[PDB]
Design an enzyme around this catalytic site. Sequence first.
Site, PDB file in Angstrom:
ATOM      1  N   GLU A 143      41.127  94.324  42.980  1.00  0.00           N
ATOM      2  CA  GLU A 143      42.154  94.849  43.890  1.00  0.00           C
ATOM      3  C   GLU A 143      41.802  94.736  45.375  1.00  0.00           C
ATOM      4  O   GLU A 143      41.640  95.750  46.051  1.00  0.00           O
ATOM      5  CB  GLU A 143      42.454  96.317  43.542  1.00  0.00           C
ATOM      6  CG  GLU A 143      42.986  96.493  42.119  1.00  0.00           C
ATOM      7  CD  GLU A 143      43.577  97.874  41.845  1.00  0.00           C
ATOM      8  OE1 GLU A 143      43.457  98.764  42.716  1.00  0.00           O
ATOM      9  OE2 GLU A 143      44.172  98.062  40.756  1.00  0.00           O
ATOM     10  N   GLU A 265      44.550  94.908  34.335  1.00  0.00           N
ATOM     11  CA  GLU A 265      44.695  96.337  34.102  1.00  0.00           C
ATOM     12  C   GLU A 265      46.154  96.675  33.892  1.00  0.00           C
ATOM     13  O   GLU A 265      47.023  96.185  34.620  1.00  0.00           O
ATOM     14  CB  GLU A 265      44.157  97.165  35.275  1.00  0.00           C
ATOM     15  CG  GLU A 265      42.686  96.994  35.573  1.00  0.00           C
ATOM     16  CD  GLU A 265      42.222  97.900  36.690  1.00  0.00           C
ATOM     17  OE1 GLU A 265      42.987  98.820  37.052  1.00  0.00           O
ATOM     18  OE2 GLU A 265      41.101  97.690  37.208  1.00  0.00           O
TER      19      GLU A 265
END
Length: 531
Positions: A143, A265
């Site tokens: 991220e 995810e």
Amino acid sequence: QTDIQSYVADMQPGWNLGNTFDAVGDDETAWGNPRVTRELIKTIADEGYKSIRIPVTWENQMGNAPDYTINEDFFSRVEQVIDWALEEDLYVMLNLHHDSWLWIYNMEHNYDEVMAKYTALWEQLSERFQGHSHKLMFESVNEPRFTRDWGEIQENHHAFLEELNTAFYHIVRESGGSNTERPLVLPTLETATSQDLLNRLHQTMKDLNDPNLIATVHYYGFWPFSVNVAGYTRFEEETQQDIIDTFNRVHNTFTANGIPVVLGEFGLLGFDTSTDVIQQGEKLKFFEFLIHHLNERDVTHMLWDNGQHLNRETYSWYDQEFHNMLKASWEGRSATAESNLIHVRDGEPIRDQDIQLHLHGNELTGLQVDGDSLALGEDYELAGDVLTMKADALTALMTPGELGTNAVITAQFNSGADWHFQLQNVDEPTLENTEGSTSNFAIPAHFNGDSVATMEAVYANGEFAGPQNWTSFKEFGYTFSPVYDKGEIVITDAFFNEVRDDDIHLTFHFWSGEMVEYTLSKNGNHVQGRR
């Protein structure tokens, strides 16, 4: 189909060893998870998972400049877990995790040092795993986000991510050995799914000109539903459409061309608070829908598990119904219904009850209670997709005066998971007067077999009160919390910190359809509750 596409297809489905090594602290136990056991890994394989993501945060295990050598104990533990997972014939994904916002985030104003540490890290990682199987893959950074000046996204950000990805690529590819054709996993900015971010990752990949590259994104559901705010208590059209649009453009940009995608995810954001934040039936419907559309678009997915899904002490799932729905969804669609609850008012003549099924191409084949089939035409009927519970069956299954779940009716289908109706005997929920301070406030509650879906808060003048002023519906678990085992509803310090001194009208919405009004008078640190 190409080799890398088959490689990625072979990873379906995957599991995240969350809050494990990625924990920000002295070691992998810093966030409450136990050290990794062989049995944990073996369990994940046994449950049908074919790949595991191992997030690692490295910052607190690094020596000083310029070597930034990784602590050998920690590193050996990470490698051991990776070896265990390879032994179970799992695919493994290894990364840099919280380091992203810990010390990668600061590249604009610290470039040389950040590049230095990043380089040292991926050099040590490249070298350590030089001989390991190709089933082990590297992803550059979790991220990626950078210091904000003119909003959360800007141009130099894109440049920074491309430089990180490119540097990573060349370190690994120059390492040689099995690192030469090791699959590499690259993130969009913030692992988000905006068309522009997708395009820029695409461009980076075209630049690298390498057959063994994988795009990765993350997804946690249409925000208001995922955290239960603004009245998005049910899995409805906007949530569904957000899934469809999101993965449509993911598919068009990457999968449609030669690039395979890993949803590295997924979950629901609200789970960070608790699993109890999303009503069970709605949760199940969300995951069923999501995994169906991921499958239709060949997206390999990997569930985020911070310790809250698999009980790592007993090596079994906290919520078996949940995992059964996931497992079923790996193979195909499951039928669902408009609700997983059947409400019957206690002390109200028990009548036939209709229930809207969502067959999703499946067929109902029976009902069961306690493993025993129910009677066609004496216990239930089916018109089309509409299920009727007969009044005598409901009567037989229930107990006058006992509120709560009196039985579980299991719907069985020709394909997919079974759907479990909770037969709730309810009465109208009741609240009581109370007095307290803003830091210790709880309304005594008689839930009477019912459950709180959400809560509205408006001032006496009709203006929206509390956090997220733009809506009357307050966020579950952040602003309020049903505590059933203590018969109360907590109103948090966070809610009170953002309300004026005034009368506040609360409206509790229950899943039965009941709504209960309640009034707060807040003055300074003190609050009066009035039924």
